[PDB]
């Protein structure tokens, strides 16, 4: 039935006079797929939506929200497109030169070089990494700290009742905000940014976002056993739990 739904979109996109209904329905369809984490499904739909839809449509409470929801959804997708690239890279680290104990004088020199070339690649694989870390992070904070009212949260409050959508928007927050936090923690930990890891407890507990309400009690503790792990590595470095110099 996947196709039935992703195909009803091209029918609504064809007629430009129904772009407001095409987007709204595109949202709904992408709300079902997100709850299943079908990101190639959600995105295959996301491209069918002409890149210039938003511009033309220009506002009923149903169109202000669907424009916001669409960008929220793009903010979410882009937060998985850049992580899978980053993650793919983290798993392609240059491998150490192989050792040939009891080497011939030939094998000694081939190895002096293979050992010197590797000490060039590992520097760039931290180079490319840093730039894929700086980018995946930004996206994770665009979703977690979504501007003007939080992610998947309507700004317009005068639409007509849509319990399906509304409760789909509360759910999407409880499936994906705990899951984006845990990823960002995994990104920060993987790159050794431990001080910042611990600063996820400010972001989450914050009264500005009230992200902690989107967490189950279990997920919290789990995030608290994740942070205590970053803390350790900060002690091994000689700093206090939170990364500040011990005077």
């Amino acid at each position: 039935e996947d196709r039935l739904k992703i195909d009803v979109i091209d029918w609504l996109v064809f007629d430009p006079a129904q772009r407001a209904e095409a987007l709204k329905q595109g949202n709904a369809i992408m709300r079902k797929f997100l709850a299943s984490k079908k990101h190639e499904a959600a995105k295959e739909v996301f491209v069918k939506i002409p890149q210039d839809s938003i511009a033309e449509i220009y506002l009923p409470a149903e169109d202000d929200n669907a424009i916001r929801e669409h960008l929220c959804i793009r903010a979410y997708l882009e937060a998985h497109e850049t992580f899978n690239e980053w993650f793919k890279h983290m798993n392609s680290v240059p491998q150490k030169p192989a050792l040939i104990p009891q080497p011939t004088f030939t094998e000694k020199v081939a190895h002096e070089h293979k050992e010197k070339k590797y000490e060039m690649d590992f520097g760039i694989w931290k180079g490319h990494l840093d730039a894929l870390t700086a980018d995946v992070k930004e996206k994770m904070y665009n979703v977690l700290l979504f501007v003007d009212g939080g992610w998947m949260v309507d700004v317009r409050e005068d639409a007509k009742e849509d319990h399906e959508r509304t409760h789909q928007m509360v759910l999407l927050r409880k499936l994906c905000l705990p899951m984006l936090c845990f990823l960002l923690h995994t990104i920060l930990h993987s790159t050794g940014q431990y001080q910042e890891c611990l600063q996820l407890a400010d972001m989450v507990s914050s009264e500005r976002h009230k992200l902690y309400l989107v967490f189950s009690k279990e997920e919290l503790r789990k995030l608290l056993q994740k942070l205590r792990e970053s803390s350790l590595m900060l002690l091994d470095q000689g700093l206090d739990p939170l990364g500040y110099e011990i005077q």
Binding site: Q199, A201, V204, Y212, L224, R228, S231, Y244
Partner: protein
């Protein structure tokens, strides 16, 4: 001082030789230089016990001298066999720093448990001797006793407990703002994740909401005066109500608007010296900036015999606004 020098001279020559020596021989001259070092340390112990009290300065300077030698006899025995360490540690029956680092270099968490089993306050010594410096995380589990508390508390699933100490460390916190902010956030996430009754929880998060309320003040400090005053973004201290009130009103804070003063009048219940001297100081720069609009608004934001008057002029529209300010309050 010649008797002793000739003994520290043959320790070092009994150290140069075991560098080249058939195994068994290098041990018998080691059980020997252990037999001899244990007679020197016994004679400095007996002279200590001989002298006490007044002229103590000389008796705590001779301690540092025997203590820099049971350290120079220990290091020397750090290469040697540790089977003798147990007897060197007992001969000068404390010199614990040496027998405590021999138990650390090996897997004998059984020896450092046998050491503390027969000891007078070694426990308070092995924890302060771990902090100054795997199974080291089981000794970290015990060393995390003290401010590192919250850590072993999250680990033990003692959340409520972690919340109490996380808030306690948030309060004493004065050196780093960014850190006082982090601790509360953690405390809060600890408490929320814990098992308080909905009543208790509502108390922890309300008494908390207060803390966040004061902090938020230093938090919203404009980004104009913080580069003016050349301040570190996060690496700055936990400021107090006064510093804040006075900094929110500085002539450095250029774009100071209604909200900067309103919050510089909200930080007066955060005090614990002259209240109504400042109440004036601020309402007065509230007018210097007016360039005789803002005074207007801040009287619109308050909703009144707080403000002064004759004391103030200490003038055409100050009284003029103080008339439709007697009609407003009424």
């Amino acid at each position: 001082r010649t008797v002793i020098i000739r003994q520290h001279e043959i320790v070092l020559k009994v150290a140069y030789p075991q560098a080249d020596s058939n195994l068994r021989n290098i041990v018998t001259e080691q059980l020997v230089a252990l037999i001899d070092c244990f007679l020197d340390g016994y004679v400095s112990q007996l002279k200590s016990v001989d002298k006490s009290s007044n002229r103590e300065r000389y008796d705590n300077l001779e301690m540092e001298y025997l203590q820099k030698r049971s350290d120079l006899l220990s290091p020397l025995l750090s290469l040697g066999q540790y089977l003798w360490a147990a007897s060197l540690a007992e001969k000068y029956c404390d010199f614990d720093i040496l027998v405590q680092m021999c138990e650390q270099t090996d897997n004998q968490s059984r020896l450092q448990r046998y050491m503390t089993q027969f000891a007078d306050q070694n426990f308070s010594d092995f924890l302060f001797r771990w902090y100054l410096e795997q199974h080291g995380q089981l000794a970290n589990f015990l060393q995390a006793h003290e401010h590192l508390s919250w850590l072993h508390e999250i680990n033990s699933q003692e959340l409520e407990k972690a919340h109490a100490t996380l808030l306690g460390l948030a309060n004493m916190e004065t050196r780093y703002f960014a850190k006082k902010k982090t601790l509360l956030g953690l405390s809060k996430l600890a408490a929320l994740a814990s098992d308080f009754s909905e009543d208790m929880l509502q108390e922890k998060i309300e008494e908390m909401a207060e803390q966040e309320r004061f902090l938020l003040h230093q938090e919203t400090l404009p980004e104009q005066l913080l580069a003016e005053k050349q301040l570190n973004l996060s690496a700055m201290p936990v400021l107090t109500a006064p510093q804040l009130i006075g900094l929110y009103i500085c002539e450095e804070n250029r774009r100071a608007n209604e909200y900067d003063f309103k919050k510089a009048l909200d930080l007066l219940e955060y005090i614990d010296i002259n209240i109504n001297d400042l109440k004036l100081e601020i309402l007065c720069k509230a007018l210097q900036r007016d360039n005789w609009v803002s005074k207007d608004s801040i009287f619109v934001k308050i909703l009144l015999p707080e403000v002064k008057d004759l004391l103030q002029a200490d003038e055409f529209v100050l009284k003029a606004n103080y008339e439709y300010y007697v009609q407003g309050q009424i």
